Design a protein around this ligand. Structure first.
Ligand code: NI
Ligand code: NI
Ligand code: NI
Length: 119
């Protein structure tokens, strides 16, 4: 009874938080901030990326995890998002566009979670 309704609220919330990252655009240009986070770089094309980033993460993986109910709650999805953003900021230089995008997308995610409030 009360547990299927609670699983669905959690799953809904996870969709809302995912969609915030997916849809965010740069003011002025309309550039979609999430473009370079959608799929991890090709290992064949950029092997050095995988010597720096030991646990890769991208939105394709997180989308798969959401849809296949692999996360117990949004805190698990958020930890994957945070790993993705940390990877971006570890690999890319400070003041690069991808570095700044990771920062802004992480703030948007955190702000939308506070807006949703406690379960
Ligand atoms: Ni390093
Ligand atoms: Ni799978
Ligand atoms: Ni800032």
């Amino acid at each position: 009874a009360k547990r299927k309704s609670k699983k669905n609220i959690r799953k809904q919330r996870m969709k809302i938080l995912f969609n915030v990252v997916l849809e965010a655009r740069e003011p002025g240009s309309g550039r979609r901030l999430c473009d370079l986070f959608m799929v991890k770089p090709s290992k064949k094309d950029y092997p050095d990326y995988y010597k720096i980033i030991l646990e890769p993460m991208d939105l394709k993986i997180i989308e798969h995890n959401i849809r296949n109910d692999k996360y117990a709650g949004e805190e698990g999805m958020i930890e994957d998002m945070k790993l993705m953003f940390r990877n971006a900021r570890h690999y890319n230089e400070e003041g690069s566009q991808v570095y700044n995008d990771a920062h802004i997308l992480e703030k948007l995610l955190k702000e939308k979670r506070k807006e949703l409030g406690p379960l």
